Amino acid sequence: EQELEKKKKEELEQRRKKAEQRCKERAEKVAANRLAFAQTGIFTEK
Amino acid sequence: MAKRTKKVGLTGKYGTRYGRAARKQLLKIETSQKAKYTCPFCAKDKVRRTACGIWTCRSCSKTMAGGAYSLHTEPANAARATIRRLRLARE
Amino acid sequence: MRAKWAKKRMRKLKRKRRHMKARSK
Amino acid sequence: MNVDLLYPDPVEEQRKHKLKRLVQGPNSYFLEIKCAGCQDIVVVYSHANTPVFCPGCTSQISIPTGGKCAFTSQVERYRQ
Amino acid sequence: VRINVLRDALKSICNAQRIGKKQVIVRPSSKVIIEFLQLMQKNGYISDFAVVDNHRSNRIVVNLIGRLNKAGVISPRFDIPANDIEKWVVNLLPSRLFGHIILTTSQGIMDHIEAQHRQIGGKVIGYFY
Amino acid sequence: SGKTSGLYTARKLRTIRRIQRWADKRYRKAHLGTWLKANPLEGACMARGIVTQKIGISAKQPNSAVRKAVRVQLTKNSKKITAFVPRDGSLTYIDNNDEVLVAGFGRAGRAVGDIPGCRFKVIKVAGIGLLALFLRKREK
Amino acid sequence: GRMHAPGKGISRSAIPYTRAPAPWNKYTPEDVCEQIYKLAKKGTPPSQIGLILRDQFAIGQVKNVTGSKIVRILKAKGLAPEIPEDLYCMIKKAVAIRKHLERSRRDKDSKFRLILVESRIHRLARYYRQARRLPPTFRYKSDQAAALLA
Amino acid sequence: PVKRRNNGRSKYNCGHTNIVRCQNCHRCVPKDKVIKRFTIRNIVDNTIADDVLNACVIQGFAIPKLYNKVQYCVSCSIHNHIVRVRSREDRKIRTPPKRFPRNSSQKK
RNA sequence: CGCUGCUGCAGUUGAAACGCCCGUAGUUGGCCCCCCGCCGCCACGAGGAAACGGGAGCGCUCCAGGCAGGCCCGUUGGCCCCGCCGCGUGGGACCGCGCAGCGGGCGCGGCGCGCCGCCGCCGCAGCCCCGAGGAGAGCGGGCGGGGGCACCGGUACCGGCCGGGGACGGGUGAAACAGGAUGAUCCCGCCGAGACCGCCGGCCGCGCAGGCGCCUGCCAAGACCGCCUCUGUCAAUCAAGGGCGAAGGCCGGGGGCUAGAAGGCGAUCAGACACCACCGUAUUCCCGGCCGUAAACGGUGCCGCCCCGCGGCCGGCGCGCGCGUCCCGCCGGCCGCCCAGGGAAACCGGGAGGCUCCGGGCUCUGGGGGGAGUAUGGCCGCAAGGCUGAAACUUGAAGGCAUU
RNA sequence: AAAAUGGAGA
């Protein structure tokens, strides 16, 4: 049974689960990758 | 568990004999007689009654001159502090 | 206090029945 | 005397309960405070629950009380 | 706790009108209490109303024509067939001249008069004298 | 009264009505079922039987005269119950054991008027109506 | 109803009507996100997270600045509380109350609170078991209540 | 047929109180149903105040003033006439009558 | 006879809110997502034996009757019944609940297509309503005779001890019972236990209620108010089930200062069994258990809503003011009087009002006065007693508040 | 200080 607990962990890993960087890709994103919101000239997209 | 529902379990060792007053009074005293109280120095509940009056704690390896049926008889427990009161007052 | 001296009288009547019911059986 | 419930009168509204008013709104405000030594601006709630320390001075600029937060340094009024 | 908003509104409106205060407040706006109020305004018992809106329950401010005699609710809704609409008019309406019982029918929510004439009977939400 | 009212509460009201129905003295009288067994008469207009010892029950107040009644054992339940005689001086006709029918006092259980402790009323003796015996309409 | 306690009070407070961000808005909504995780890194529970952000920093309302709840940014991030703070804190209270009851058993009144708080904990946890917050197996018990902190 | 709204007591937000016994009856009474008149009286009688003041061996002496509470039971109060049963109109009058701000146990 | 109450009854005093609180089923859950699908739900059919009854036409010598009658609707006997809890048909208002990201391509992927696969594929605005004068948690500050555990200071009362002094002392409504020249009462010092926490002490405050008052501390809280703090309906009342619960009682110890059920006296009165004096045991105080009841009463269950004004007291929290416990609100609780309104009245009116114009929710209880809390079973307790709970029979009022 | 009755039924 204890081994199947490890198997349950395996199925969880495939799910997005823990993506701390994805939630924190906001303040860090606003310093480097922010696009044309103020004085940037690259407005046109795709 | 709870083999004999009535509270007279320690004193169930007697059976139908010896009346209903004596058996009940014995239950309280007998349970107190074999109880593990806490020796002062050892501070662990390892004391039993070696013989009426003298009780000793296995860990503390010390013999306390307590009561016949309990490490601290109720009247003495008071006298303790009354000696302390007179003494603290003396100096 | 009639209620008290009726109720406790009733209790004395109730107790009399108990001895009468058991001793007779 | 002309008093109208539909168009709510603001003067009485202030004295009214934060919930009893025709609209249940906040009854507290954010106040920036002026540290006398330096001009860093610290925003504090009208009623403070946790202490805010003026940047550059470890000692809390606000020691919270059940309602108004007093300040060890001089106070900048509201937002001004 | 508060289960029937309309009873707390009906006695809110009726009690206020009893003192003669035209403007009244209601703690929660309901789309069903909108139905009773706008059918009251439609029959002319109540005057222009409004809901000051927070994002929560909302409060209803209603001005009155001052003519309301009685209003009330049947809790909870009891369903009557369109055959029995008139027995309920006898018990809960003073006269058949000013009779109005709020019925709920799937095809629109109307007062008792129009519904039986439309041969549909649903549940009696509240009484309107 | 608290009252429990909801669209799905036909339970509270059904039990309550059943339990609180048997509170009336009259309801319990006809619904306990004790009354058919308890009444000397088995719930009937009249009961045949044989006459036993005659009786002179003192009245109460205002009425202050002895009212002659006869105690008869109803044949069907083998029980002895007293029956008030009809009109003035009508008891002299009734003496030893004779066929007697007994009927209710209207109240159906309570003793009639102010004559205490009598629940039933004789209506016949022998094979002739006892109210005709009084008028000598029908008599031995 | 103040739940079990009879005493009734209104202690609620009114947050700002604008659903959109406050005007001054000293930081960016994006800037707000890194401060909230930092509070998970500081170890602040979610209730205390809003309180400290509220006075220490200008941010006072979370939804207005960013469209989420204190816990929803944290739930997407690594620190997601399985036992919501509102239960974790009440379990913490039962242990603390048990400590008085074990030391002295003569306090029937404190025993009434330890009975009241146990009962409140059970009600809140039946909610979190029907929802996905707490596992169906999770059941409050008397002995491991101390260990539930882990 | 409730006689008084107070019910002879000032108990509000309460359930039970302490018992003080009547000086006359000796009857235990809860603090709520007891009269509790506070009385200030000079220790000597007023009649012999003059001769004792005349014997003022110490300078500027003043009479011994005693502060005590009198708490008669309900039955003790009526028979010793501390208070008198009154009519419905008089029931709500919250004041002791016959003025008397004079400082002695006897009102004189 | 709305005196069985669903419509449509009472429960502050007639009959009646569990002593108190938690609590599982049960019942009941605010706004709120138009459109989809199920619930329930009405409209509304199909097919549902009559007799009987509602009800065509009809003059037995008139009906009650019957369905006959006459140159006649193919003359009749038409029609509504049957409840049929299903079954169609439709509305979807209300009513409860709804999950799996969609979608496209390959797709006729077998007389038409689905499954199911396989593709981020590009069409996704792909994705967490709100933040309840619901509740839970949180934080800041005060709040209280609120609780436990130690600790401890007073005086009193009683009992000793020494000293002094000098006959009476006690007790009362008067008296007497028992004190006292081995010296009482009395007057002071010295002391020993045991309870008790005085005046301050209250339309004060606290607490689930019973209840809560020595000084020092110590432990766990509770309610409260304030807040741009999260939680997101976790809610209400609650059978069964628990937890407490004054005194008295009981069961073993410990303790024993005063009062003091019993029991003794004296003194009362034709009796004094008693009232009153004087002793005095159980008890009272503590610990460990049982009891589980009180006029446990506010004689008024709980959670909600709306109110008519005038003042207090306590808890915060703001309001300006020459800053004074100054005013003025937000108040949460304590309340007094009371306006309509209600009530058989008395009275209530921070309700017992909004209600014969009689329908927020939810537990409990009553049905003339006896018998009767009895009998009989069960349960509980060691017992006392508790808890549950009829009848046979009686008999005409019992009762409620008010007027002289 | 003591201090007890008041037949039935207009």
Residue numbers in the entry:
A (entry chain LS): 148 to 193
B (entry chain Lq): 1 to 91
C (entry chain Lo): 1 to 25
D (entry chain Se): 44 to 123
E (entry chain SJ): 2 to 130
F (entry chain SO): 1 to 140
G (entry chain SP): 2 to 151
H (entry chain Sd): 2 to 109
Sentences from the paper on this structure:
Giardia intestinalis is a protozoan parasite that causes diarrhea in humans. The highly compact and uniquely GC-rich Giardia ribosomes possess eukaryotic rRNAs and ribosomal proteins, but retain some bacterial features. The translocation intermediates, with naturally bound tRNAs and eukaryotic elongation factor 2 (eEF2), display characteristic ribosomal intersubunit rotation and small subunit’s head swiveling—universal for translocation.
Unrotated state C (structure C-III) and rotated/ratcheted state D (structures D-I and D-II) represent PRE-T substrates differing in their SSU and tRNA conformations. Structures D-I and D-II represent these hybrid conformations in which SSU rotation causes tRNAs to acquire the A*/P and P*/E states. These states constitute proper substrate for eEF2·GTP binding, shifting the equilibrium toward the hybrid conformation. The D states show relative SSU body rotation of 9.6° and SSU head rotation of 11.1° with respect to state C. States D-I and D-II feature rotated ribosomes, each with two tRNAs in hybrid states. Interestingly, these structures contain a tRNA in the A*/P state, such that its ASL moves toward the SSU P site by ∼10 Å compared to the tRNA in the A state in C. This movement breaks the anticodon stem interaction with H69 nucleotide A1744, but the interactions with the monitoring bases A1410 and A1411 as well as G457 are retained. Further, the elbow of the A*/P tRNA also shows deflection in transition from the D-I to D-II states. Structures C, D-I and D-II appear to trace the path of the A-site tRNA toward the P site.
